[model samples]
Target chain A: MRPITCSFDPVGISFQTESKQENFEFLREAISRSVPGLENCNVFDPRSLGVPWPTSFPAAAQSKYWKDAEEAAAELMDQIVAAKKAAKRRELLDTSVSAPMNMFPAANAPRARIMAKAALLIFMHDDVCEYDILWQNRIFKEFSEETNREDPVVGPQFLQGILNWVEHTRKALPASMTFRSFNEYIDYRIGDFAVDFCDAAILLTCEIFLTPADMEPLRKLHRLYMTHFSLTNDLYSFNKEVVAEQETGSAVINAVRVLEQLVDTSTRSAKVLLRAFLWDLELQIHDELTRLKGTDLTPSQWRFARGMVEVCAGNIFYSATCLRYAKP
Target chain B: MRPITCSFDPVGISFQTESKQENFEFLREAISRSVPGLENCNVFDPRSLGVPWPTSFPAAAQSKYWKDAEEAAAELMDQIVAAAKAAKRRELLDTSVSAPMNMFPAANAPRARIMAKAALLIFMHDDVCDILWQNRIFKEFSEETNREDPVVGPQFLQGILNWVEHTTFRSFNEYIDYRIGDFAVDFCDAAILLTCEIFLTPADMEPLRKLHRLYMTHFSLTNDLYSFNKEVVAEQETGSAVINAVRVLEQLVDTSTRSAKVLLRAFLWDLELQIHDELTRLKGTDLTPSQWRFARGMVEVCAGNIFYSATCLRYAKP
Candidate 1:
């Protein structure tokens, strides 16, 4: 068994060389523990454990097609950062949810998936909020049938996912406990990089920059993303979510990699939509993969994978208020 | 101090008996407790609480207008409830904060107000369902303010009106500690009777239901509800909810009648509607008294006074 490594960067960018091998070592070691569900996926990536070989952060700011997604992204960020100078809580007024007060580039629902999972982990441990937002979706929202069989620490079925995230990921106190909680406090709450990046990325994608001061030009380039779902090969394959209880080897992942890589290589705009698109796509895949099985979701919920696609294509695409609807 | 003698009977038909006595008792108690915002407004009915009596639920139900209102209400309830039902999570289901489901029956909002408030108190203090549905409104949904505020306890807020009702209202602890909640364990939650009665009498006044439910039966409608401005009135009252601070009274006590009481006969329907309308009126009054507030609801909330109208309109008419 490969020794698990610890030097990996998160955001899907990976570092190569033997250090990459080392990161995998830590991963495999964790899986090696007597955890029930830690049996290895047949296709584990060695590079997944290592830091990006200079490719992770400082990511592809620009693409051959997208003048440089980052440069495009940065140009727009500069615009919003400027408006924010004048923005105050008082200034942030809306007449009603529907009343048009400010024209914000809205962040879509797909990007919001991360918050529910992370916050839920913190909350279920009896952390801050005490109420439960009951959903029609049983998979992520309801208690697992196993929870039906056994007494899981928390109430919801998927609660075991948080426990498993802690159990299989490392060896500190059970995340359901304080030490893991402390670590989560670091990674989930305190850590700036991984913390709210999804929200930031969505905002970057959603802001409507009509003015020239900071955002207008950036928004112009991102127009292609207005309907980029057209880029998918098959409506179902490209958009399908990677849910639990399904084969982890679903072709949807490969389809996205191909679509994103192709889009990255092909698009000639200043903002690479691929990053946000990939983020949205992967968000679905990761959430579904990480979701615990024994628990069923409420009625309205789609498989987690499908839910993300709907969030992206439906809510995010439709909402100009989403942070992702930005110029640049 | 008037003793708690009046109880709502299903068949008692007297507008004079309900309005006058009940309202006076409510106001005197409400004002004494520091909820003085309504003190200046002459929103009382002597006969309703004292002797004359106000509207009766069964008689109102017999009217053609009541039938019209119910049909309209059922449709609106279905739409909003459907949206809420369709939601993957409770919070997302209730995303229509500033924008309540347009399809909701207008009158339902007032009643919903009461139901949610009562439900939450019972849920929080009573153990009936484990976690209360109304508490879910606070901790889970968009109902929570970014600033920290635990907000109101139901009948406690209801008491601000000064209408007399039977018995001391349920406490948050009593409801919170109650196993399986009032609904799950017992055939009745405390507010169950109130919820049922309000649907008949005043719901006809709320036109949005007339539209949503398309219940064209009730030709006559209410004078334009100050649904828009009353939100401000409510905010004026409960704007200062602080940490660990309890408001003037419990969720369902009378503000004025802490020591007064004509009886419960008069305003029971209104008392009931107060909760139901809040829950049902999701469409027109997305931003209601405590439920919604602010210039744009840019954002403050209002305490509801729909019950005041029910008790006052008609010696019972304040």
Candidate 2:
């Protein structure tokens, strides 16, 4: 068995490479054969990015909490389906399970369960509110006002999680199509990515409490992590999102779209640029982590810091493997 | 004159450029010749960043309230120096004047005056409490507990009391959150609101929370950067726990003073980027006209604060 390690070194692979082109052609053909409705978008394997699995992956995968989290997600999906009477909502259950499993692969069972439930609620909400601005606003208002009250559907635990998610979403939703620049979009897109919820999950799983003060010095790192996670998700989910926007006439909010407009490039070229940007961000994260280690951060802070890296890598792995964004 | 405009494009210039190097060398030599005790450090011109002078600059610069603000700062400096019995404290009056002038360059005269007074108080407090953590904590507590009962005064005071009673900061984030109160940012915000006559409901302000926080952190960190050397000297002389951001960065990164200063500069630059982004996003939101004005006002506060700190006589000593 090889010892587990984490590395942020450049993947040394370019989107323009012959092998990458060949691989994308193969995948596009394969997807075209299987799903006629899907677009001919390029797919990049996240494993090629050189982000390693956490050392505790084996134990976390084998833990009772893994099954417990899956069961909890199933239970919540059942409630959501019953409440919404929407049979298609069950598809989000896979996201609830897969995202937590990948993102917090090293978290303890109980913490994993909490994060899994949160992920389930987030995916379910995203699916339901994807196209309805009014619904999004109303849900955000209700959640903000009723956070202290009990919810009839998923109970108090999930309500608070939803509130935290909506708090970020409400702020991001207003400027979805109004972003003037790529950097501006990213600043808000970090919130739109639900990174705040992930931050909370990281703290819960690590069993560390960081006040706003404790999190202050780490804000730059946190923003970097959020940007990485958001862009990675956007990269994998772009084709499906693009197709959805085309079909539904929704405003485009993906990074690829933003970059394409900013640089006046084709979609494929914009995607290539995004990949390069993601790689650069990864190197920045590596440098930042190295700098942070030299500081007077406590043991818990160190744990939380490392956890952010794990989550970033894990998110990439999840996006590449998950079937959620495989089709539009 | 050309209408004012703002640009966030890359400066297209690198620190390694020949001109940059030559410029740094020239400045370093000039400083070395003038101040033998001063350390050799690189300085970057903020103007080179392409941040526009606000279109309102002329009106603000020529406002009758500019003199009024300067007089207010002088009066406060007299009070502070007399109260402290420290003759050297009067040097901070320059900060009270220069910071408000630069930061709120686009603000109305009254608003700029209010900000100038706040800047004066902040600089004076910073100078007096550079090395005294206990004194810092106690002063924060007394101010909070002594607030008069009004619509939200008691609650605001309690918030300060809660912040001050707990002074042990285990991390940089914790220190920043605590420093927000110690820096009297909330008080400054209130003054802005009152002077600007912007009445925002709690709901109206909710969406602006993140923006407000970014402003506070930027304001606090800018102050810390300018006051780093002064605080370090105080720390060495009095052996007090210096709470400046540079010291925090030093301990966090295990880096030297110069490295920490560089790291802090990077942080501030990122913050400025974020602030601009937030302001752009807020423009798309359904905020009222007054709310929008308040948001822009906060941006001026940051600009003024940074300008003041960088050139203030209070922190320029060897």
Candidate 3:
């Protein structure tokens, strides 16, 4: 794509909000009650953060602020993975908008856009051609030759892919997307269609490549945003998982991911402040969403948002925070 | 090469004049010696008796005739082999041009032309390329992705090389004329160079492609003519190898490779009788040079002749 310029600025310590205004109340409430006021820190839109393929950042900046946060949030990523494991039921979330109309809900545009794009991704990323693309990406190949291997992205990989589409035939993506927990893309039995029972967890994001100095605040802030999005974005949806359902009285799973990033500062006062900074906002967001826990949700469903943070943050602020002290 | 119409005529039995003349000599000599005239039936020159490369007779006729002669003189073809063997050589000559030239100098041209072609009698009726061209003709290739495994030739084993000519670097006439020998054409080695050594062979000649038929005949006729000019020519810078190297007594290697038809009949007569029948009239000739072998030399060269019969009859008449 040709270059287009846009700007997003930091509000206080955090970068601009990743979620929309409509999502802030539910997302922040879930994060605050889990920790105390962790939401007030600088926030980043997770969608705006990632290393686009074909290029990436070198290691990272050494900072007492980052060291403390990552140490505070280390176990959160594992608990998210454990939640996926416990959610063994092969199903997609009910993404249907069920309330009185927010804006005039169009009939086909939303559904068509979701289905068409998801179907294409499902079809193209199927196992047969994925292995074919992966095997060819080694360093020895000329750049022109390596152009055959591309990742789904909005950069050089996208430019190359648009020029050369492969020659192959595959089953329709929606028809082939099974809800079975298979990370390996496609396995065909020619049986029932999975899209009927599953709505894909749409992970929509874009990233800009930049210097290390520019990306640091972005990483630390997005980690906090995803931490909240992971927790309260859909309390009903997340509660279905077992490890997450363990969050009965604990921080929401969202804060767990960001808190997992908190570091220990070495200087006497700076360490305590960054330490307090890690938990300060998340506690408030966690309380506001606590009212939604048991009202209409299932037993494990309510417990999931409650227990998810305890499982993740238990190790995040303990070993990680102290490890940050040792390293940073 | 666009097709063109041409002319050829029936130069019939009277064409046998020179062979008849030599036969007449046999008759005269036989009577004077108190021997029967018709008793000595022999292989005569076909051209001297009217057949040519376009002899229009069948292939089997000559092969059968030569087979009988070959059987009769089996030991003679062998003793020449024995001679080459005792002298430490791998190749055994089926026959050479030595005997006919010494005993019947006039018959050399007719015989030379005949040997220039394939004569079953002298070459044991087998095509020279039959053994020599065997490997070069066709190839066996793997039919699949895996090349390590051997596969079959496109045709049956021997069918592949059925007509392969495999251009051996044979001597041109002038070159052979230089290699010291007598007035006889030695069967030249199947080589690609005139290094004058007998058996230096190289293997992969498959690259010549498409031109193989031309390559085959050109090399074949060239070898024939080289041995021709060497055995029969009167003067040359280098001497003939067969004539000088092989003893005066051991030669009958001649045959014109022009066409098989005329040659089948040519193998049925003696060299002197063949020369007498096939040669042109020398008396009325207005061409410059007047020596016997020189004046009628063109006609003798043009006429299809063979040497195996004449030499075999001599070797066996004893």
- Best prediction by DockQ: 1
- Tell me candidate 2's TM-score on chain B: 0.61
The deviation in Å at residue A177 for candidate 2 is 4.4
Q: Score the docking of each candidate (DockQ).
A: 0.03, 0.01, 0.01
Residue B171 shift from truth in candidate 2, angstroms: 68
Comparing 1 with 2 on TM-score, the higher-scoring candidate is 2
RMSD of 3: 31.5
The docking category that best describes candidate 3 is: incorrect
Candidate 2 lDDT at A218 equals 84
Local distance difference test scores for all models: 0.25, 0.55, 0.24
Over B1-318, each residue of candidate 2 has an lDDT whose tens digit, in order, gives 111122221111212221222211322343225322111111223444443222111111112255667776676455433321544545565556665555444335545455555556555444433011112223333343233223333333333333333333459888888777665554555544544445565677788889888889988887887777777777788986677888787888789877787777777767766776776787687887777756766765675565455445545445
Candidate 2 C-alpha error for residue B227, in Å: 78
Better of 1 and 2 by DockQ: 1
Which candidate has the top score in TM-score?
2
Q: After superposition, how far is residue B123 of candidate 3 from its true place, in Å?
A: 55
Error of 1 at A36 (Å): 14
Rank order (by lDDT, best first)? 2, 1, 3
